[PDB]
Every structure is written in structure tokens, then in C-alpha cells.
Design an enzyme around this catalytic site. Structure first.
Site, PDB file in Angstrom:
ATOM      1  CG  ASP A  79      14.485  21.924 -36.578  1.00 48.25           C
ATOM      2  OD1 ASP A  79      14.454  20.845 -37.205  1.00 48.25           O
ATOM      3  OD2 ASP A  79      13.729  22.180 -35.617  1.00 48.25           O
ATOM      4  CG  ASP A  89      13.846  29.526 -35.075  1.00 43.76           C
ATOM      5  OD1 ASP A  89      14.185  28.895 -36.098  1.00 43.76           O
ATOM      6  OD2 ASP A  89      12.806  29.280 -34.429  1.00 43.76           O
ATOM      7  CD  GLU A 146      13.458  24.164 -31.815  1.00 42.65           C
ATOM      8  OE1 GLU A 146      12.614  25.054 -31.596  1.00 42.65           O
ATOM      9  OE2 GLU A 146      13.360  23.445 -32.832  1.00 42.65           O
ATOM     10  CD  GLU A 147      16.227  27.558 -32.242  1.00 44.28           C
ATOM     11  OE1 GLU A 147      17.181  27.427 -33.032  1.00 44.28           O
ATOM     12  OE2 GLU A 147      15.121  26.999 -32.400  1.00 44.28           O
ATOM     13  CG  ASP A 185       9.948  25.180 -29.689  1.00 46.25           C
ATOM     14  OD1 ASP A 185       9.144  24.386 -30.231  1.00 46.25           O
ATOM     15  OD2 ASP A 185      10.681  25.932 -30.358  1.00 46.25           O
ATOM     16  CG  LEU A 202       8.815  31.190 -33.584  1.00 42.33           C
ATOM     17  CD1 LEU A 202       7.723  31.945 -32.845  1.00 42.33           C
ATOM     18  CD2 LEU A 202       9.486  32.130 -34.573  1.00 42.33           C
ATOM     19  CG  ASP A 203       5.793  24.512 -32.102  1.00 44.10           C
ATOM     20  OD1 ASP A 203       6.445  23.499 -32.406  1.00 44.10           O
ATOM     21  OD2 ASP A 203       4.556  24.595 -32.257  1.00 44.10           O
ATOM     22  CD  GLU A 220       9.265  20.480 -30.370  1.00 38.02           C
ATOM     23  OE1 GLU A 220       9.305  21.300 -31.310  1.00 38.02           O
ATOM     24  OE2 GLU A 220       9.707  19.320 -30.547  1.00 38.02           O
TER      25      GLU A 220
HETATM   26  O1  LIG Z   1       6.368  18.576 -41.040  1.00 38.83           O
HETATM   27  P1  LIG Z   1       6.069  17.564 -39.954  1.00 38.83           P
HETATM   28  O2  LIG Z   1       7.041  16.405 -39.985  1.00 38.83           O
HETATM   29  O3  LIG Z   1       4.624  17.139 -39.890  1.00 38.83           O
HETATM   30  O4  LIG Z   1       6.419  18.310 -38.552  1.00 38.83           O
HETATM   31  C1  LIG Z   1       5.424  19.182 -37.978  1.00 38.83           C
HETATM   32  C2  LIG Z   1       5.836  19.363 -36.526  1.00 38.83           C
HETATM   33  O5  LIG Z   1       7.175  19.939 -36.561  1.00 38.83           O
HETATM   34  C3  LIG Z   1       7.269  21.050 -35.667  1.00 38.83           C
HETATM   35  O6  LIG Z   1       7.485  22.205 -36.439  1.00 38.83           O
HETATM   36  C4  LIG Z   1       8.458  20.818 -34.740  1.00 38.83           C
HETATM   37  O7  LIG Z   1       9.586  20.971 -35.580  1.00 38.83           O
HETATM   38  C5  LIG Z   1       5.972  21.096 -34.887  1.00 38.83           C
HETATM   39  O8  LIG Z   1       5.543  22.402 -34.549  1.00 38.83           O
HETATM   40  C6  LIG Z   1       4.980  20.380 -35.794  1.00 38.83           C
HETATM   41  O9  LIG Z   1       3.991  19.706 -35.032  1.00 38.83           O
HETATM   42 MG   LIG Z   2       8.314  23.295 -31.979  1.00 36.38          MG
HETATM   43 MG   LIG Z   3      11.148  26.032 -32.308  1.00 37.31          MG
HETATM   44 TL   LIG Z   4      10.466  18.953 -33.237  1.00 35.61          TL
END
Ligand SMILES: O=P(O)(O)OC[C@H]1O[C@](O)(CO)[C@@H](O)[C@@H]1O
Ligand SMILES: [Mg+2]
Ligand SMILES: [Mg+2]
Ligand SMILES: [Tl+]
Length: 329
Positions: free
Chosen positions: A62, A68, A91-92, A112, A114-115, A274
Site C-alpha cells: 500500500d 498511517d 499493517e504498517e 490496522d 488506519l483502515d 482486518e
Molecule cells: O478498493 P477496493 O479493492 O474495493 O478495496 C477496499 C478495501 O480496501 C481497504 O482499504 C483495505 O485496504 C478496506 O478498508 C476496504 O474494504
Molecule cells: Mg484496512
Molecule cells: Mg490501514
Molecule cells: Tl487490505
């Protein structure tokens, strides 16, 4: 208001029975502090110039944003200072973090910080996800202590930086929601013993991947749009932040899907910080969480940054999709 049922009181009261060292309260108190600090930064991120990238990429590839880094630092420092943890997985961070002996406690935390990174700059809901394990082994703490199946969780949940800030916490007997009071900086209990509807009417998936979906997901979606029995079609929602879509699934019911696909055998979402935490919340709310072939919480991980497909939510919706996978097997 002269009697406040805070997260701290809750995690203290209900858990007086089983006594314990009380470091889980220390842990959760600490994490609440990091979550308040993240919430405050997020709520003013543009004025504080916290939007944008950090200038780096993490193990799952990412692009690291500034928030983050800030959130990662805050969560790591408070957990360490809590005296309740020994191994940290973020995650980081490429490797597990081992707490210094002096500050070691009995828990292993996967999080995680920051999600919903793609949703930072457009001000859509983002959040923080965590799962907590008891270190079992007797040997020196190591990355291995983190490589437990999700059914071994003792606590898990998420903070949601949405229209309000919410801390959703699941433990062995159930799920409870605490809202941040911004005036006194306390998480207040607002939803007790939360349970998911047996069947919802919302499906949530990124249909931009239609060309890669397996036949079972394809069929399921077609069935939501054209129900064979003349029921109303399901509505669609996809915020694009797992914490926001999962929280809606929890309180409105329905299904959330991030399945495997033709290019991603194991899906995208990360099992340790996650998928497992959300699967545990769902299971404690009466919901289900599956890869399409097996329960997410029963997977034994071999990589702390391991990915997994995940389908979760109302048991009758998730079961409907599993029957379609079984039919296609
Ligand atoms: O853009 P995409 O492939 O739908 O990914 C969305 C998913 O990716 C994330 O950001 C994880 O990277 C989640 O929070 C989210 O559900
Ligand atoms: Mg996430
Ligand atoms: Mg994250
Ligand atoms: Tl992810």
C-alpha cells in the site's frame, strides 16, 4: 449525566467475576487514548495538513499516507506503555514488534492503525481495527505468538471515525458499542449486547471486479438484483472502508464481501488485523464470516501479513452464498 457508563467501567465491572491481573482494562484504556488522538487528528486533518502520502510502501504494497504513520506511532506507543502487551503486529510494520522486557504484559495485539486509506482524502469514514490474543507459549515472545487462529481471540473490535466516533468492542459474551463524547473525551456505552439481524436487505461489494469474480459470487449478486421469488431486490452499499461497511452490516444487517477472485486467490484483506477481528465481532453478534469455503476464525495463519477472502454478516445471507459455493464445488 452524573453516572457515566464508560468503556473503562464496563470492561472493569463485567470482568470483576473472573478477577485477572486487570491488564485488559489497562490495554483497552491505553488503546482508547490512541483512538481519541487519532480521532482528533482526523477531524482536523486538512487544516493540519495530514492528507497525502508519507513517501513509502508497506509489505502488502500500500502507499503509506501521513495519517498511517501518525496513527501507527500512537497505537504502538500507548500499547507498549500499557504494560499489557508483549508482541505487536501492525499493517504498517514488516515484522512483529516485540515489547521490551520491562514493559511486557500478557497480550498479543494485531491491528490496522488506519483502515480505509483510499477514503482518507475524500473525508469518507475511516477507522482502526484490532484483535487481541493471550500469549500462550512460555518461551521468549516472538512473531509466532501472533500466528494464532482467530477463534483464539479474547477481544477484538474497531474504532470508526464516521459522523460520530464509535468504539465497537467484542469479547467472549458479546458485542457492545461505545461512542466518544468529544466534550469529555470518554467512550460512553450506547448500544448493549448488539446482535445482527438474521437476514438483511443490503449487499456490499466492489462490483468493479465483476470480470474477475468466481461463478458463485457472480450468481449471488445476480440473485440480489433479480430475486427468483419476486421479493424486492437488495439495496447496494459500498463505502470502500471495511470498518464503515462492516459496521453498517452489524447495525442494519445484510452481507459484506471481499472474496477471492481470478487474480487474488486469497482476496485482498489481511487476515490478522482486518479479517479476524471483524469475523470475531460478527460471530459474537450472531453473524457469520466465511472465505466461501471455511470459517475465517479457524484459519491457522503462516504469515502475519497473510491475506484472506471474507464474506460476513447476517447468517441467512452468508449461508445463502455458502450454498452457492457448495453447489459450484
Ligand atoms: O478498493 P477496493 O479493492 O474495493 O478495496 C477496499 C478495501 O480496501 C481497504 O482499504 C483495505 O485496504 C478496506 O478498508 C476496504 O474494504
Ligand atoms: Mg484496512
Ligand atoms: Mg490501514
Ligand atoms: Tl487490505
Amino acid at each position: 449525566d452524573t453516572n457515566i457508563v464508560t468503556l473503562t467501567r464496563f470492561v472493569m465491572e463485567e470482568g470483576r467475576k473472573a478477577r485477572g491481573t486487570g491488564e485488559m482494562t489497562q490495554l483497552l484504556n491505553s488503546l482508547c487514548t490512541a483512538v481519541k488522538a487519532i480521532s482528533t487528528a482526523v477531524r482536523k486533518a486538512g487544516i493540519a495538513h495530514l492528507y497525502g502520502i508519507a513517501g513509502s510502501t508497506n509489505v502488502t504494497g500500500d502507499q503509506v499516507k501521513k495519517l498511517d504513520v501518525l496513527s501507527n506511532d500512537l497505537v504502538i506507543n500507548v500499547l507498549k506503555s500499557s504494560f499489557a502487551t508483549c508482541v505487536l503486529v501492525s499493517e504498517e510494520d514488516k515484522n512483529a514488534i516485540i515489547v521490551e522486557p520491562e514493559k511486557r504484559g500478557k497480550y498479543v495485539v494485531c491491528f490496522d492503525p488506519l483502515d480505509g486509506s483510499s477514503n482518507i482524502d475524500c473525508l469518507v469514514s475511516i477507522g482502526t481495527i484490532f484483535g487481541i490474543y493471550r500469549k500462550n507459549s512460555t518461551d521468549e515472545p516472538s512473531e509466532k505468538d501472533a500466528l494464532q487462529p482467530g477463534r483464539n481471540l479474547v477481544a477484538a473490535g474497531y474504532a470508526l471515525y464516521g459522523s460520530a466516533t464509535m468504539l465497537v468492542l467484542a469479547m467472549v459474551n458479546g458485542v457492545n458499542c461505545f461512542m466518544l463524547d468529544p466534550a469529555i473525551g470518554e467512550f460512553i456505552l450506547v448500544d448493549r449486547d448488539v446482535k445482527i439481524k438474521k437476514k438483511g436487505s443490503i449487499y456490499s461489494i466492489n462490483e468493479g471486479y465483476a470480470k474477475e469474480f468466481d461463478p458463485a459470487i457472480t450468481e449471488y449478486i445476480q440473485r440480489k438484483k433479480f430475486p427468483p421469488d419476486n421479493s424486492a431486490p437488495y439495496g447496494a452499499r459500498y463505502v470502500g472502508s471495511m470498518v464503515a461497511d462492516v459496521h453498517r452490516t452489524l447495525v442494519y444487517g445484510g452481507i459484506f464481501m471481499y472474496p477471492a477472485n481470478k487474480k487474488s486467490p486469497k482476496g485482498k484483506l489481511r487476515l490478522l488485523y482486518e479479517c479476524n477481528p471483524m469475523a470475531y465481532v460478527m460471530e459474537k453478534a450472531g453473524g457469520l464470516a466465511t472465505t466461501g469455503k471455511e470459517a475465517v476464525l479457524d484459519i491457522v495463519p503462516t504469515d502475519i501479513h497473510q491475506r484472506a477472502p471474507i464474506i460476513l454478516g447476517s447468517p441467512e445471507d452468508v449461508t445463502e452464498l455458502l450454498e452457492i459455493y457448495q453447489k459450484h464445488a
